[PDB]
Amino acid sequence: RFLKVKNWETDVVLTDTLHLKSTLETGCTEHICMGSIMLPSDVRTKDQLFPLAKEFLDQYYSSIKRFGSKAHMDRLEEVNKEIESTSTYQLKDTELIYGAKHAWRNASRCVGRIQWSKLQVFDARDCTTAHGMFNYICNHVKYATNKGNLRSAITIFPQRTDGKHDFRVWNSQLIRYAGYKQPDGSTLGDPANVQFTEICIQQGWKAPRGRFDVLPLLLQANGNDPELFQIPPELVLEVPIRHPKFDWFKDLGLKWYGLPAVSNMLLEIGGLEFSACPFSGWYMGTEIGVRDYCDNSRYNILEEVAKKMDLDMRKTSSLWKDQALVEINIAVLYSFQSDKVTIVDHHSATESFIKHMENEYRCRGGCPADWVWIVPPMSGSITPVFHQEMLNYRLTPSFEYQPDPWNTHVW
Amino acid sequence: RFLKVKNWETDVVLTDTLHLKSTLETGCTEHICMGSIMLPVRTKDQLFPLAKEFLDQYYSSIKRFGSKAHMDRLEEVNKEIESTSTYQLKDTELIYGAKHAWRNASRCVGRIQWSKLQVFDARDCTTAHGMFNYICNHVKYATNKGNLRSAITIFPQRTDGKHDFRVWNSQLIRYAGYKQPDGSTLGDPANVQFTEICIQQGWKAPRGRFDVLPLLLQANGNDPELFQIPPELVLEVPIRHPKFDWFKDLGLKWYGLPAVSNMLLEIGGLEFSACPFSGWYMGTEIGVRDYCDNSRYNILEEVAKKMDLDMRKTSSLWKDQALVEINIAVLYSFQSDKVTIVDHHSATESFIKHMENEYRCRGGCPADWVWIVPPMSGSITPVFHQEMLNYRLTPSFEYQPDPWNTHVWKG
Ligand code: HEM
Ligand code: HEM
Ligand SMILES: Nc1cccc(CNCCOc2cccc(OCc3ccc4ccc(N)nc4c3)c2)n1
Ligand SMILES: Nc1cccc(CNCCOc2cccc(OCc3ccc4ccc(N)nc4c3)c2)n1
Ligand SMILES: C[C@H](O)[C@H](O)[C@H]1CNc2nc(N)[nH]c(=O)c2N1
Ligand SMILES: C[C@H](O)[C@H](O)[C@H]1CNc2nc(N)[nH]c(=O)c2N1
Ligand SMILES: [Zn+2]
C-alpha cells in the first residue's frame, strides 16, 4: 500500500505515500475505473466542520514546523470555540495564503503546478457589492497582466454562509469572447460562450456582434441579482496571431487574450467554501491553438487554414488536419513570444511537470496527477508525461467544480 | 444500477449496464485511481465456477440458455474437471472465446472488427517445429499478399505450469536491436534484450538495422528453439514521402503484419499462454511510437534536420512538424504498396460507432481512454471528447511474465 509509479521512457520509479493522506473519493471502485469521466461527485452542519478545520490546521502547523506547539494547540482551541458559537470560523491571512497555494498544489489536472508556491493571493473577504467585486477584479487583472510579464494570482471573496448569500462570478473566465448564433446556420465568435453571451444580452449588454467581442463581467455579491460591468480595454492584453513563415496567416484576422483567468470554481479550505475565487496564470500554447481554435464545437478553423495551405483535404489519411494543427500552434507561440507576452509550449510545460513530480515525490512523498488531463491534446507521446505513470487522488485544500449560478439563483 | 457516459463534443449520452457483469478487479479504489498504471497454477477448486460462468455466456449468445444441450455440457465439464482437474473447450467454444477476448479488450481501438477473426486451432501441437509450421501458416493467411486478415492461432492450454507453450518473441515479426560498445544502438532499441537471447541461443545475427528476428518457440515446457521465418512470408514496405524525395534516403522500412505473441488468453478459467494474434496497423503505431519514441528508432532529429527546421528551441515545434511528416510517409508508403493500414482519424471514428453500437446491443463497451486516444493530435479525434468506462470482462487477453524470467532450463 506504498504505491509505485514508473516512467517507461527512463525506468525512474517513485514511491507514493502522500495518497494515504487522501480524504475525498475518486469515483472509481475495484470493479470500474471512472478516470475519463469529466465530473463525478447545502450548508455544512456544525458537526463535520470541526474535523475539517482540525485536519487543515494540523497540516498548516506541520508546514511551519510547529506541530503540537503552544501556538498550534491554542489556535486549534480558538477555532474550536468559534465554531461552537458562530457555527463557522474565519481563517487568518497566513492560513488563507497557505490554503490557496495548496489548492493549486493539489490540483491533479494542472500541468503548471511547478509554480504553485509563487502565487499572489488577494484577500477580498471585506467585499460587499458587485461594484466592489468589479474593483477587486480589475486590480487582479492589472496585477496579473503586468504588461505581458504575467504573474499568477487569485482573488478570494467572502466564504459561503447559508447558501442564500453566495458570491459568484458568473463568467467561466474573467476574459472570454462572445458567441452569437446566426439566423441561418453557423456561429459567430466563440460557440462555447453562446448561452452566456445570450444571458448577458438578455440582461442589458449591447453586443457589438463581432468575432472577438470581450464579454462583460456578470458579478453576484451576497446572493443578489448579478450586475454587468465592462472590463476597461486597456486592461485586456491581446495578441494578434501571425505565422513566422506564412504571410497570409495575418490575413485570417485572429487574436487571443493574454490572461487565462478561471472564475467559476470553488475553493475549499478547512471545510470553508469560497464560491468566488477567480485565479489566473499564463497560457500553454495548445490551450488556444489546439482546443480554442480547432475543437469542432469551438472556433473550428482547421478547414480554412488547410485550404490556404493548399493541402489535399479529400481524405483523412493525408493528415491535413495534423499539419494545419501544428502550424496554428507554431503561430500562437510565435505571436505571444514576439509581443513579449508570457506563454509556455507543451514540450516545456510537460518537462517542467516531470521535474515538479520528482520534487514533490522527494520533498512531499507524492504528487496527485490526472494523466487524462496532464498529457497535452497534441503530440502526446513525444512529450515526457505520456510515458509517466501517475496516481490520481483528492487532497484538500482543493478547487472544485460548482453548478452554473443561473441554474440555482432565485431571480 | 445504471451508469452514464457523455460525449462532450456531441452531447450524446449512453447508459452502461454491462459493467455489472464485471468479475475481475481494476486496481482502482474509492480513494485512488490507477488508470494510468501500465499494469496494475489454477486448481480444480476455483475452476468450475469459471467454466460455468463462461458456458452460461456462451449458451446465452447462441440463444440456448437453459437448454438440454446447455445443461448436458455443464454436467460434462463438471465431471471432466473433478476427474481430470481441467477440461477441454469445444471448437465452437474456443472460437467464441477468442472473439470475445478481443471484443473485451478495453485498450484496443480496432474492435469494430472483433467478430471477423479467423481462429486457428493449434491445440494438437506438440513440438516447437510444429509451432513453427502453425505460425508460418498464420503469417501467410494473415498477410494475404497485403490484403490483411485478422487471425489468431491457439496452442495447447496450460496444465501444471511446468509444460507451458510460449512464443518467446513479443511479436511474430520484429527487427533486431544491437547495443554497440560505444553505447549506441543499431536497429530497434526495443528489441535489444530479446536479440541478445537469440544470439545466445545460437542465432547468427546479420547485425543490420532491419534484421527480422528469428522465432524462439517453446513447446510443452521444453527449452525454446530457433526458427527463421521464410523471408517471402515477411511482407515489408519501404518508407518514402509523397513530397520529400530525400525521405527514401533515410533507408527506413517496416513490416506489414502486426502480430502480438506474448499475451495470455483466458477462456472459462483455461489459460492459453501461446496465442499469437494479428490484425493490421494503425499508422501512428509505426510513425509516432516505433520511429519517434526517444527509446526507439528516434529519427525525429534527422527528419527535422533534412527539413531544415529551427531545432534551437522547442517552441518552434520542430518535433511536432517532423512527427506529422513521418506519419504521412508511413501511411503513403503502405497505401502505395496496397498493404492494409488505417489512419488514426478513421480508426477513432470507427471506434465511436463501434462503442455506440455496443451500448445498444450489449449494454456497454469497456474502454481505456489512456490507450484509445491516439499518441498524436489527440483532441482532433472524436475519442478525446468521449467519456469511457473501464472494467474487466472475461474471456480476456492478459499480460504475463516474459518466459526467460520464469523458465526452468533443461540443458
Ligand atoms: C501559471 C501557469 C499555469 C499553466 C501553464 C497551467 C496549465 C493548465 C492546463 C493546460 C490545464 C488544463 C485545462 C484545460 O485543458 O482546459 C490546467 C488545469 C487546471 N489548472 Fe493550471 N495552469 C497554470 C496555473 C494555474 C493556477 C495559478 C491555478 C490556481 C491557482 C491553476 C489551477 C488549475 C486547475 C484547478 C485546473 C483543473 C481544473 C479542473 O479540474 O477542471 N492553474 N492548468
Ligand atoms: C484489426 C486491426 C486492429 C487495429 C487497428 C488495432 C489497434 C490497436 C492499437 C493501436 C492498440 C494500442 C497499441 C499500442 O499502442 O501498443 C491496440 C491494443 C490491443 N489490441 Fe488491437 N488492433 C487490431 C486488432 C486486434 C486483434 C485481431 C486483436 C486480438 C485478437 C487485438 C487485441 C488487442 C489487445 C489485447 C490490445 C491491448 C494491448 C495491451 O493491453 O497491451 N487487436 N489495438
Ligand atoms: N464544462 C464544459 C461545458 C461544455 C464544454 C466543455 C469543454 N470540455 C472541458 C472544458 O475545459 C475546462 C474544464 C474545466 C476547467 C477548465 O479550466 C481549468 C484551468 C484552470 C486554470 C488554468 C490556469 C492557467 C491556464 N493556462 N489554464 C488553466 C485552465 C477548462 N466544458
Ligand atoms: N516492456 C517495456 C520495456 C521498456 C519499454 C517499454 C515501452 N512500452 C511499450 C508499450 O507497447 C506495447 C505494450 C503492450 C502491448 C502492445 O501492443 C498491443 C497491441 C496488441 C494487438 C494489436 C493488434 C493490431 C495492432 N495494429 N496493434 C496491436 C497492438 C504494445 N516496454
Ligand atoms: C504511462 C502510460 O500509462 C503509458 O505510457 C501508456 C500511455 N498510453 C498508451 N497508449 C497506447 N495506445 N499505447 C501505449 O503504449 C501507451 N502507453
Ligand atoms: C472525455 C474526456 O474526459 C474529456 O474530453 C477531457 C479529456 N482530457 C482533457 N484534458 C484537458 N487538458 N482538458 C480537457 O478539457 C479534457 N477533456
Ligand atoms: Zn480509476
Task: Reduce the secondary structure of chain B to three states and give it as a string.
Answer: CCEEEEECCCCCEEEECHHHHCCCCCCCCCCCECCCCCCCCCCHHHHHHHHHHHHHHHHHHCCCCCCHHHHHHHHHHHHHHHHHCCCCCCHHHHHHHHHHHHHCCCCCCCHHHCCCCEEEECCCCCCHHHHHHHHHHHHHHHHHHHCCCCEEEECCCCCCCCCCCEECCCECCCECEEECCCCCEEECHHHHHHHHHHHHCCCCCCCCCCCECCEEEECCCCCCEEECCCHHHCCEEECCCCCCHHHHHHCCEEECCCEECCCEEEECCEEECCCCEECCEEHHHHHHHHHHCCCCCCCHHHHHHHCCCCCCCHHHCHHHHHHHHHHHHHHHHHHHCCCCEECHHHHHHHHHHHHHHHHHHHCCCCCCHHHHCCCCCHHHCCCCCECCCECCCCCEEECCCCHHHHCCCCC
The answer to whether residue A310 neighbours chain B at the CB level (below 8 Å) is no
Segment holding A327, helix H or strand E = helix A320-338
CA distance A38 to chain B (A): 7
Q: From the CB of B387, is ligand 6 less than 6 Å away?
A: yes
**Residues 6+ away with beta carbon under 8 Å from B365:** B16, B18, B111, B354, B355, B358, B359
Q: Is A282 annotated as a binding residue?
A: yes
List strands edge to edge, sheet with A227-229.
A168-169, A217-220, A227-229
Residue B408's nearest CA partner among B220, B198, B212, B149 is: B220
- The answer to whether A60 and A98 are in contact (CB under 8 A) is yes
Phi, then psi, of A154 in degrees rounded to 5? -135, 140
Ligand 5: which residue has its CA nearest to atom 15? B371
Cell of B407: 523458465
Torsion angle, CA of A228/A234/A235/A237, rounded to 10 degrees? 120
Q: Residue A146 carries which DSSP code?
A: G
Cell of A178: 462572445
Cα B235 to Cα B258: distance, rounded to the nearest angstrom = 11
Query: Chain B interface, mutation test: which of A14, A15, A36, most B Cβ atoms within 10 Å?
Result: A36
- The answer to whether B271 and B395 are in contact (CB under 8 A) is no
Please tell me the number of the ligand nearest to residue B7's CA: 6
- The answer to whether B185 and B150 are in contact (CB under 8 A) is no
- The answer to whether B346 and A317 are in contact (CB under 8 A) is yes
Residue B294's nearest CA partner among B195, B189, B192, B376 is: B189
The neighbourhood of ligand 7, an ion, using CB within 5 A, equals A 28, 33, 35; B 28, 33, 35
**Residues 6+ away with beta carbon under 8 Å from A226:** A130, A168, A170, A203, A218, A219, A220, A405, A409
Cα B211 to Cα B188: distance, rounded to the nearest angstrom = 9
Question: Which A positions 290-309 lie with beta carbon below 8 A of chain B?
Answer: 290-291, 294-297, 302
Query: Chain A interface, mutation test: which of B10, B25, B33, most A Cβ atoms within 10 Å?
Result: B33
Q: Residue A354 carries which DSSP code?
A: H
Cα A51 to Cα A71: distance, rounded to the nearest angstrom = 18
Q: Which residue has the cell 477473426?
A: B117
Torsion angle, CA of A351/A266/B373/A179, rounded to 10 degrees? -110
**Residues 6+ away with beta carbon under 8 Å from B218:** B128, B164, B165, B166, B167, B168, B224, B225, B274, B403, B407
- The answer to whether A35 and B40 are in contact (CB under 8 A) is no
Q: Residue A157 carries which DSSP code?
A: P
Cα A215 to Cα A193: distance, rounded to the nearest angstrom = 9
The answer to whether residue A330 neighbours chain B at the CB level (below 8 Å) is yes
CB contact under 8 A, B317 and A389: no
Q: From the CB of A380, is ligand 5 less than 6 Å away?
A: no
Segment holding A101, helix H or strand E = helix A93-105
Q: Residue A212 carries which DSSP code?
A: S
Residues belonging to chain A = 411
- The answer to whether B58 and B69 are in contact (CB under 8 A) is no
CB contact under 8 A, A33 and B390: yes
Query: Chain B interface, mutation test: which of A19, A25, A33, most B Cβ atoms within 10 Å?
Result: A33
- Which atom of ligand 6 is found nearest the CA of B9? 5
- The answer to whether B37 and B72 are in contact (CB under 8 A) is no
Q: Which residues of A285-297 are buried (b: 16+ CB within 10 A; e: fewer)?
A: bbbbbbbbbbbee
- The answer to whether B8 and B385 are in contact (CB under 8 A) is yes
Is A282 a residue of the active site? yes
CB-nearest to A326 from B294, B314, B324 is B324
| SS3 at position A373 | helix
The structure was resolved experimentally with X-ray
Breaks (C-N over 2.5 A) in chain A follow: 41
Q: Residue A21 carries which DSSP code?
A: G
Q: Residue A219 carries which DSSP code?
A: E
Cell of B2: 445504471
Residues belonging to chain B = 411
Ligand 5 centre to CA of B84 (Å) is: 41
Cα separations (Å) of B8 from A26, A37, B379, B381? 20, 10, 12, 13
Cα B100 to Cα B94: distance, rounded to the nearest angstrom = 10
Q: Which residue has the cell 465511436?
A: B352
Strands A283-284 and A343-344: parallel
| SS3 at position A154 | strand
Cα A164 to Cα A223: distance, rounded to the nearest angstrom = 6
Ligand 1: which residue has its CA nearest to atom 38? A109
Strands A279-280 and A283-284: unpaired
Terminal-residue alpha carbon distance, chain B: 56
Q: Which residue has the cell 525506468?
A: A11
Q: Which residues in chain A are closer than 8 Å to B294, comparing Cβ atoms?
A: 9, 382
Residue A211's nearest CA partner among A179, A181, A183 is: A179
Segment holding A398, helix H or strand E = strand A398-400
Cα A80 to Cα A89: distance, rounded to the nearest angstrom = 9
Cell of B44: 480444480
Q: Which residue has the cell 511446468?
A: B162
Cα A356 to Cα A362: distance, rounded to the nearest angstrom = 10
Cell of A331: 503561430
- Which atom of ligand 2 is found nearest the CA of B397? 35
Residue type, A92: K
**Residues 6+ away with beta carbon under 8 Å from A251:** none
Cis peptide bond prior to B242, omega within 30° of 0: no
Cα B86 to Cα A88: distance, rounded to the nearest angstrom = 65
Segment holding A343, helix H or strand E = strand A343-344
Q: Which residue has the cell 449512453?
A: B14
Cα A321 to Cα A289: distance, rounded to the nearest angstrom = 13
Residues of B that are catalytic: 108, 111, 280, 285
Cell of B269: 478459467
Q: Which residue has the cell 535489444?
A: B192
Ligand 7 centre to CA of B390 (Å) is: 8
- Record the resolution, in angstroms: 1.7
Which chain B residue is nearest to residue A392, measuring alpha carbons? B33
- The answer to whether B290 and B330 are in contact (CB under 8 A) is no
Phi, then psi, of B386 in degrees rounded to 5? -100, 120
Q: Is B358 annotated as a binding residue?
A: no
DSSP secondary structure string for all residues of A105-142: HT-TT-TTGGGTT--EEEE-TT--SHHHHHHHHHHHHH
Segment holding A100, helix H or strand E = helix A93-105
- The answer to whether A303 and A309 are in contact (CB under 8 A) is no
- Which atom of ligand 3 is found nearest the CA of A265? 15
CB contact under 8 A, B19 and A26: no
Cell of B346: 478513421
DSSP secondary structure string for all residues of A380-394: GGGSGGGGB---B--
The answer to whether residue B316 neighbours chain A at the CB level (below 8 Å) is yes
List strands edge to edge, sheet with B225-227.
B166-167, B215-218, B225-227
Q: How far is CA A67 from the centre of its chain?
A: 32
Cα B208 to Cα B231: distance, rounded to the nearest angstrom = 15
Q: Please return the burial class of B74, using the count of CB atoms within 10 Å of its CB with bins 0-12, 13-18 and 19+.
A: middle
Cα B297 to Cα B292: distance, rounded to the nearest angstrom = 6
- The answer to whether A214 and A177 are in contact (CB under 8 A) is yes
Cα A130 to Cα A218: distance, rounded to the nearest angstrom = 9
Q: Is B102 annotated as a binding residue?
A: no
DSSP secondary structure string for all residues of A227-294: EEEPPPGGGS-EEE---SS-GGGGGG--EEES--EE-S-EEEETTEEES---EE--EEHHIIIIIIHH
Q: Sort residue B261 into left (φ over 0), alpha (ψ -120 to 50) or beta.
A: alpha
Cell of B334: 503502405
Q: Widest CA span of chain B, in angstroms?
A: 74
Q: Sort residue A163 into left (φ over 0), alpha (ψ -120 to 50) or beta.
A: left
Question: Which A positions 163-192 lie with beta carbon below 8 A of chain B?
Answer: none
Cis peptide bond prior to A368, omega within 30° of 0: no
Residue A137's nearest CA partner among A229, A8, A37 is: A229
- The answer to whether B335 and B291 are in contact (CB under 8 A) is no
Strand partners, A274: A267
Residue B119's nearest CA partner among B142, B87, B136 is: B142
**Residues 6+ away with beta carbon under 8 Å from B10:** B385
Ligand 5 centre to CA of A32 (Å) is: 19
Top mutation candidate among B371, B373, B377 for ligand 5, by most atoms within 8 Å of CB = B371
Total Cβ atoms within 10 A of residue A123 = 16
Cα B121 to Cα B96: distance, rounded to the nearest angstrom = 12
Cα A353 to Cα B330: distance, rounded to the nearest angstrom = 31
Q: Which residues line ligand 4 (CB under 6 A)?
A: A 8; B 258, 260, 279, 281-282, 285
CB contact under 8 A, A330 and B316: yes
Which chain A residue is nearest to residue B317, measuring alpha carbons? A330
Dihedral of CA B104/B105/B106/B109: which sign?
negative
Terminal-residue alpha carbon distance, chain A: 50
